[PDB]
Write the structure tokens for this entry.
Amino acid sequence: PISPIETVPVKLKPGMDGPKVKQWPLTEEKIKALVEICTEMEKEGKISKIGPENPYNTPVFAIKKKDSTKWRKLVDFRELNKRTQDFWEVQLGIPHPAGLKKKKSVTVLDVGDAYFSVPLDEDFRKYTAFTIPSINNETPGIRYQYNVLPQGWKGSPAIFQSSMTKILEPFKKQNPDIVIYQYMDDLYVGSDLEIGQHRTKIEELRQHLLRWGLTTPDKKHQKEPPFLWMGYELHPDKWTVQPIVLPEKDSWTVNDIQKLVGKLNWASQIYPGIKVRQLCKLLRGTKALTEVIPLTEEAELELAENREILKEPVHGVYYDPSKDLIAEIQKQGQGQWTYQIYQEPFKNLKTGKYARMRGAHTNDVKQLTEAVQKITTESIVIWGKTPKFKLPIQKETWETWWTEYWQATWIPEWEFVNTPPLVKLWYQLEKEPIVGAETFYVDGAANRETKLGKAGYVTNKGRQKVVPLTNTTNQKTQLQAIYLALQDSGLEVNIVTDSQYALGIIQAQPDKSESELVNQIIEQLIKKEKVYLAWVPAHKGIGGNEQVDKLVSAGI
Amino acid sequence: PISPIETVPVKLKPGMDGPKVKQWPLTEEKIKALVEICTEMEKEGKISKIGPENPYNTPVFAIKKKDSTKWRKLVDFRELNKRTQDFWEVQLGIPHPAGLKKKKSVTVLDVGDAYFSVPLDEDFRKYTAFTIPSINNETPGIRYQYNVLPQGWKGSPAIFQSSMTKILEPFKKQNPDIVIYQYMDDLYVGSDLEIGQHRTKIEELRQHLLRWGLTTPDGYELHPDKWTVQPIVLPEKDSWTVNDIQKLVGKLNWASQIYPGIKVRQLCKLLRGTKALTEVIPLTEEAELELAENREILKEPVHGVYYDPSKDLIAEIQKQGQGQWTYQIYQEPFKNLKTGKYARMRGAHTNDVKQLTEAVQKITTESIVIWGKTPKFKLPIQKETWETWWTEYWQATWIPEWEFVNTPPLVKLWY
Ligand SMILES: C=Cc1cc(N(C)C)nc(S(C)(=O)=O)n1
């Protein structure tokens, strides 16, 4: 039944008119079924047959030819959606099983006439017009428009959630011990009541909703064994996500793919590594929900990697507000980190992996910091507080790093956990120039016009080198010069540049970079026993710098 | 119960729409605090529940102001304030006293409760929407908009201007040697009186405000005398190496962007050659004089600098270690309006982020006192680090604009 609740006013974006997209014809077996499904819908108030004065149209389709799946109609609102106003999505993110507290008695109610029993803003219905295809042309097709929140329309979820909140509000006040969570058509109700009274408070809720227009069938059916909330299995002492199965086939429609991305977004919340970039590609640029879009090579590869991940189940425990959260991180091999959040040893709430990179040049200690920050924020989202950290970094390592970093850094309450490969600063810059180490004054230049450059050095001991370079830049030549000096020197060396660029990069003790050059500089830096790097203004006297400049700039 | 008196019409700047700024995640205590605060504000009609068909949003969170008291609510209206039309003569409120910066002490009163008695233009409320988040997203957000002048919105102080004048008229008759300046939710009161003499007049003013509907949270002493600039200095070693000399010339060169009268020549002289860094050099006389020369030039404040009321104020900060920091404020590069230092540690915070969040508030306050605007900040920190943590240490009812920088070797140049 359609709910008595007040509609929410809905607007088109300013300057935009309504949809005016035309119907595709077809099989007069699709037209049957459509007309059946439609008359049924019309019987229940969801839609009304209308008058041809209405100028707007959006397409209709018929899907799942039998297959033990009778038929089902399919409205393509893509065009209307782009024309309807934006909405504020209130939710910061979707709820996680580990965020749930332990409850003696739990029920999940289903909202079937979810969308199809919440009224649409009267003024807005005219824009949801569609036609069922006119077989022959002495008259047009059957016209209709929606009276409730349409399936794929941009506003249904926001408005549906809004409405569920107004409707549940009375019943919550009357019942402050009971917690209710709405998610799509799942309604989670938990309490610590005895199964006798709890089941009883539920019947009351079912009536409450019923008064407001919302049905809720004698649940039983034949799905009662496991107990599912938004795809999670909620057992008494733990939750589980059963392995997800992605369809296999080759003929993939726009609709098939739109469905796939959704089911992958739900999933990336529980599993680490789920990717959707290639699949989303296949979509925009086209039309026709039912047109077959063949999978690119990359897309095919994303799907393979996605199955491999979604291959295993996931398990976790519930949250106990009376216990600290602990989070533990391990290094996993070049930009790879794993973490476990728990409250009691070995009973995990949530586990994940961070695989990323800072910018172009980074180090394990920066990465660990960002990982700590990413985890802090997740924790606040899911539990509203921050975990105590256990990190594979010695206090002294962190102590010397944050002491000397030109940027402010911080890490919350933490303790050292001597575990996998510990997190280390791979080399250090010397504070003071080194006695009896040779001094290389390096320099580099390159013609912006021609791309040709030279990189080389000059040392206090009469040593020298100049190297001709094709297609590089002022900035690369500077780096090449420094490398030269690293190559051609002993375990101790004082280098001197006038390159702000170069000096900055080395200053931050990168142990990893996306520049081949820089990575070779690193491997050099780690061999050396003592390095001292030094900046000076270019184009000044500076006896050292002056010469290297002359030599390195015969590229004018 | 609000006042049926006419509302001032308020518009956004032409071409601009409302804020659509995402709410950041909040801790549990902050949530429970705000739900409590708002529930009460709604009963009093200060704000109203709204739904998702209102597309705008501004983040909200909660703080503890004067001496870790109890929860205050803080809406980050930086985006709405930029998008909100200006007010000409009632520009950002009133003119700014030049004599406020010259008083023995200055105290900062939180006068935000006042705004909640003027109704806000009806067509404008929608742009004031904010959404309290829920833990693990169990609930969905509680959304509200404002029915009255909101705290934090630049429109509020300007619309309440004429009421403020009238409310403070009495107190200024009885005290003409007191300077008063309103910046947003705040009242800056400065006398050159005497710590106890002065402080009684704050409680005195507070009582006067209290008898006028202006409840005031239950000061915060600051002294714009104790404000001096950080002079640039050079070392004066007994033994000078090639490196020593080399560093020095580097400093002197950068510093030639501020003072165009310094020369480095006689010192580069000394470095003629391809010497080892360790090599001690003896100074010329024509060079060793050059030093005391520049040492003097740099001993006298830069001259000819010009506050321009039309341009932004900009703030740079440098972490110097030791729990110590440095900042310059300026409008155009190298033409600095002030430079100072903020040293701490040896007390209670080994926390690097807490120290910077505190420095940002001292610099902003100083800047309010002196020019009546807040500077935009270049912050020596990664966006995610600062974003995950700053609010835990914030105690002001305002928020300056900021961006995140990439510091070079101009650190070892400010000390
Ligand atoms: C597509 C989203 C979705 C949604 C869902 N819910 C919300 C019941 N369950 C699943 S499942 C059966 O693949 O674990 N998927």
